[PDB]
Design an enzyme around this catalytic site. Sequence first.
Site, PDB file in Angstrom:
ATOM      1  N   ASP B 107       0.904  -1.162  -0.033  1.00 49.68           N
ATOM      2  CA  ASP B 107      -0.244  -0.020  -0.094  1.00 49.68           C
ATOM      3  C   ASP B 107       0.823   1.255  -0.045  1.00 49.68           C
ATOM      4  OD1 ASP B 107      -2.593   0.935   0.109  1.00 49.68           O
ATOM      5  OD2 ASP B 107      -3.158  -0.090   1.825  1.00 49.68           O
ATOM      6  N   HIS B 210      -8.879  10.594   3.009  1.00 51.87           N
ATOM      7  CA  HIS B 210      -8.154   9.813   3.829  1.00 51.87           C
ATOM      8  C   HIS B 210      -6.693  10.095   3.766  1.00 51.87           C
ATOM      9  CE1 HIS B 210      -7.298   7.690   0.134  1.00 51.87           C
ATOM     10  NE2 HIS B 210      -6.740   6.696   0.531  1.00 51.87           N
ATOM     11  N   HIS B 241      -9.828   4.395  -3.493  1.00 57.70           N
ATOM     12  CA  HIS B 241      -9.288   4.204  -1.959  1.00 57.70           C
ATOM     13  C   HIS B 241     -10.357   4.829  -1.016  1.00 57.70           C
ATOM     14  CE1 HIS B 241      -4.753   4.423  -2.584  1.00 57.70           C
ATOM     15  NE2 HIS B 241      -5.325   3.347  -3.294  1.00 57.70           N
ATOM     16  N   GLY B 242     -10.233   4.271   0.415  1.00 55.31           N
ATOM     17  CA  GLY B 242     -11.577   4.624   1.142  1.00 55.31           C
ATOM     18  C   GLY B 242     -12.671   4.175   0.800  1.00 55.31           C
ATOM     19  N   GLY B 243     -12.734   3.152   0.453  1.00 59.37           N
ATOM     20  CA  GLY B 243     -14.077   2.707  -0.035  1.00 59.37           C
ATOM     21  C   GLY B 243     -15.030   2.094   1.037  1.00 59.37           C
ATOM     22  N   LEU B 264      -9.984  -2.195   0.884  1.00 61.68           N
ATOM     23  CA  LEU B 264     -10.592  -2.478   2.085  1.00 61.68           C
ATOM     24  C   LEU B 264      -9.661  -2.693   3.370  1.00 61.68           C
ATOM     25  CD1 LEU B 264     -13.638  -4.225   1.839  1.00 61.68           C
ATOM     26  CD2 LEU B 264     -13.330  -2.159   1.757  1.00 61.68           C
TER      27      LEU B 264
HETATM   28  O1  LIG Z   1      -5.588   1.770   0.767  1.00 57.88           O
HETATM   29  C1  LIG Z   1      -6.489   2.488   0.974  1.00 57.88           C
HETATM   30  C2  LIG Z   1      -7.097   2.206   2.346  1.00 57.88           C
HETATM   31  O2  LIG Z   1      -7.032   0.763   2.568  1.00 57.88           O
HETATM   32  C3  LIG Z   1      -8.532   2.692   2.422  1.00 57.88           C
HETATM   33  O3  LIG Z   1      -9.532   1.682   3.109  1.00 57.88           O
HETATM   34  P1  LIG Z   1     -10.197   2.137   4.302  1.00 57.88           P
HETATM   35  O4  LIG Z   1     -11.297   3.126   4.051  1.00 57.88           O
HETATM   36  O5  LIG Z   1     -10.903   0.716   5.022  1.00 57.88           O
HETATM   37  O6  LIG Z   1      -9.227   2.991   5.325  1.00 57.88           O
HETATM   38 ZN   LIG Z   2      -4.882   6.872  -0.796  1.00 58.49          ZN
END
Ligand SMILES: O=C[C@H](O)COP(=O)(O)O
Ligand SMILES: [Zn+2]
Lengths: 337, 335
Positions: B107, B210, B241-243, B264
């Site tokens: 990531d 995020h 991202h930030g789904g 996720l």
């Molecule tokens: O890489 C992006 C993050 O995993 C966003 O996911 P999250 O919304 O679960 O923090």
């Molecule tokens: Zn990002």
Amino acid sequence: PPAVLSKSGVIYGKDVKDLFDYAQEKGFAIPAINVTSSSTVVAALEAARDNKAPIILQTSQGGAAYFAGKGVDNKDQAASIAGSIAAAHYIRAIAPTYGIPVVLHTDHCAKKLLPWFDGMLKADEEFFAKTGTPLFSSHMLDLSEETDDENIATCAKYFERMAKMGQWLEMEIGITGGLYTSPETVFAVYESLHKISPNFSIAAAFGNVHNVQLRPEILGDHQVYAKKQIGTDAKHPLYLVFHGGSGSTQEEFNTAIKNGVVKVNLDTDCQYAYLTGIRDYVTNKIEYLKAPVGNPEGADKPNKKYFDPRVWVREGEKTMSKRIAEALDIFHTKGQL
Amino acid sequence: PPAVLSKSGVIYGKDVKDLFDYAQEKGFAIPAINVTSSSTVVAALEAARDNKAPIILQTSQGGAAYFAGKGVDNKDQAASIAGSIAAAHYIRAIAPTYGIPVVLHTDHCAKKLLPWFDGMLKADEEFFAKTGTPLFSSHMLDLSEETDDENIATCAKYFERMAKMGQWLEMEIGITGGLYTSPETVFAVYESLHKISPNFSIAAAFGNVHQLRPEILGDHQVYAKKQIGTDAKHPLYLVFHGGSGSTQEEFNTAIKNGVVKVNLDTDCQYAYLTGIRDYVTNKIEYLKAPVGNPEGADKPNKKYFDPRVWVREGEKTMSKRIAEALDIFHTKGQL
Ligand SMILES: O=C[C@H](O)COP(=O)(O)O
Ligand SMILES: [Zn+2]
Ligand SMILES: [Zn+2]
């Protein structure tokens, strides 16, 4: 002091032997911890590094299967072979990062479970074909429910496949084929295995089940037998392994180590320890609800900082490591690095 | 359909691409899970297999470090490198026997975190030197906070070291210049990176801190068609991202526009917790070692406190939640 005491990562061949030889010499034994996850692996590796001690990390057939995932079926041993080899990779990759030398081993393998031992030794050979070194440091056979003469016939045939890669083998023997195990039956196994390679250790029956009281002194008898049957000055011509020794007295351990035990197995006392710190994260009970942390804001205060696994799992690792620490002190293994 | 949907294990080079093309083709996004232990990898790898869908397993800078241990010093990125490599190997070794094709990703790696990206890469190329494959399948670079020029340039510099091993690269772009992210700035990424290798993905800023403006992804797509003149409605590989938390139809609009992986993390972290927390129910048979219920203090808790029983509860809940999400992304059943 041999090369090993200054080594970092999993160790093999003569190096294993050196370590054990050292162990006998300075009179400590080395804990062999069963592991089931990267986390539990960490837990033990950290304990050993924090306490300047080498360590044996082993995986049982179930453990191995867990490394694989409890959702893979094991009708042909597939889960333990997959799991076992993945654990071996992971362990191999991370071990070096801690300052110590590690022995990667596998626990109790009966006849019933021989397929697993096949799979693992399958990989060993091809790993050796590529690297000059097997996957695992050692492996164990538990054919003590069979007959003594059969038991060593299966260990033999295996142990000559193994010796090609200088692998270590541990085998357990009890009171069946042809109570406690006789100095003779121990010497029988050494007699039929030492011709192949010196890289073998024995788990004898001596009042330790896994009415019948523990007699560690018997191990001394096994030594004084082979000592005389070989005519060596060596106090300890056998590499001995303590199963089910959990919860015994300190001086029971003493007599066993002074009688040349180099490895005590720890498994279920670590399991409890692991749970113990994660369970104490029942202290963040209301913070274990998705987005609302009652304490400060009914339902409008996020609790990602409370339920992140790298906070609570780590709490469990810490208590597992601590109990392993207690054990490294008890077995005089602490501070030999 | 290409070779990928048949294979099992971790994939590399062309096969990563083939996979992504199908993704946008048949109109599904593959879930990217952030794992932190063999245990959570399982949950992911199993929920994928059971639903006959591929998956992306990713490792964050802090999760990578967790795979080495929180007790290993990380001042120098030491812990994130070692953890990553070890996780790499584990997922490598175990993924096969789960029967799915798996993309091995890392990531968000920010500018200050480039040391990490360096170490992984060294290992990568040194793996390539022995196998003719890298260790990791794909990598990410989040340089959004930098000016967009310095963003694209630094992505470039690494991309080319990376293209020598057919490796994939994801990059994040934001609202920094050099409000949402413009079609132009994303095309500038394309124009700069397609020159080295076509193996690159883009996360763009569209109200996902995020509130969410998914249609904007399309603009990024329409625009780029023009600028190169091709039939393809999906000239870009875009990442969401930030789904965790958006409506199903948001996810749908997003696939429309050609997103092929949806990250996720935090919903799985909670899903994973759940089942284990629900062992607040057997707390009297887990408070001692011996003190059971059905007898004073002379019984065996061993089959209750065994981590093989209680962490399996968690992996199950997380697996379920990974399942839900691979349905809603319409990725359940493409094998
Ligand atoms: O890489 C992006 C993050 O995993 C966003 O996911 P999250 O919304 O679960 O923090
Ligand atoms: Zn990002
Ligand atoms: Zn035994």
